[PDB]
């Protein structure tokens, strides 16, 4: 587990496929990272990480729509706090 800080300037923002559902008691996680984007820019985020927080926020209580909306509604430095709990 660690905080993945990414700098945003001119490109788009993020570039990863997350998935989660507090309803099913499942925290947000990574399911498909992309290249040529912020994800591959930090070179520190592989399928299996659990996004439990972002930009100092708690994603432990925010449906996948709140995580995707919380990740899409951000700017500048993005601290993607995740926890490696795969397998």
UniProtKB/Swiss-Prot annotation:
* Ranges for domain PDZ: 3-86
**Phosphoserine modification, residue list:** 17
**Description of post-translational modifications:** Phosphorylated by CaM-kinase II. Phosphorylation may inhibit the interaction with DMD.
Coiled-coil ranges from the UniProt annotation: none
What does UniProt note about where in the body, tissue by tissue, this protein is expressed? High expression in skeletal muscle. Expressed at intermediate level in heart, kidney and brain, and at low level in intestine, liver, lung and testis.
| Organism domain of life | Eukaryota
- Cellular location(s): Cell membrane, Sarcolemma; Cell junction; Cytoplasm, Cytoskeleton
UniProt comment concerning the protein's domains: The PH 1 domain mediates the oligomerization in a calcium dependent manner, and the association with the phosphatidylinositol 4,5-bisphosphate.
Q: Which family does it belong to?
A: Belongs to the syntrophin family.
Subunit structure, interactors included:
Monomer and homodimer. Interacts with MAPK12, TGFA, GA and F-actin. Interacts with the other members of the syntrophin family: SNTB1 and SNTB2; with dystrophin protein DMD and related proteins DTNA and UTRN; SGCG and SGCA of the dystrophin glycoprotein complex; NOS1; GRB2; calmodulin and the sodium channel proteins SCN4A and SCN5A. Interacts with MYOC; regulates muscle hypertrophy. Interacts with DTNB.
Function recorded in the entry:
Adapter protein that binds to and probably organizes the subcellular localization of a variety of membrane proteins. May link various receptors to the actin cytoskeleton and the extracellular matrix via the dystrophin glycoprotein complex. Plays an important role in synapse formation and in the organization of UTRN and acetylcholine receptors at the neuromuscular synapse. Binds to phosphatidylinositol 4,5-bisphosphate.
Supply the name of the protein. Alpha-1-syntrophin
Q: Which organism is it from?
A: Mus musculus
Write the lineage as a comma-separated list.
Eukaryota, Metazoa, Chordata, Craniata, Vertebrata
Q: Which residues of the full protein are shown?
A: 79 to 165 of 503
């Amino acid at each position: 587990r660690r905080r993945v800080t990414v700098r945003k300037a001119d490109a788009g923002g993020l570039g990863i496929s997350i998935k989660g559902g507090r309803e099913n008691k499942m925290p947000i996680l990574i399911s498909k990272i992309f290249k040529g984007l912020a994800a591959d820019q930090t070179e520190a985020l592989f399928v299996g990480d659990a996004i439990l927080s972002v930009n100092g926020e708690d994603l432990s209580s925010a449906t996948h729509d709140e995580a995707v909306q919380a990740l899409k509604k951000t700017g500048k430095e993005v601290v993607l706090e995740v926890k490696y709990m795969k397998e």
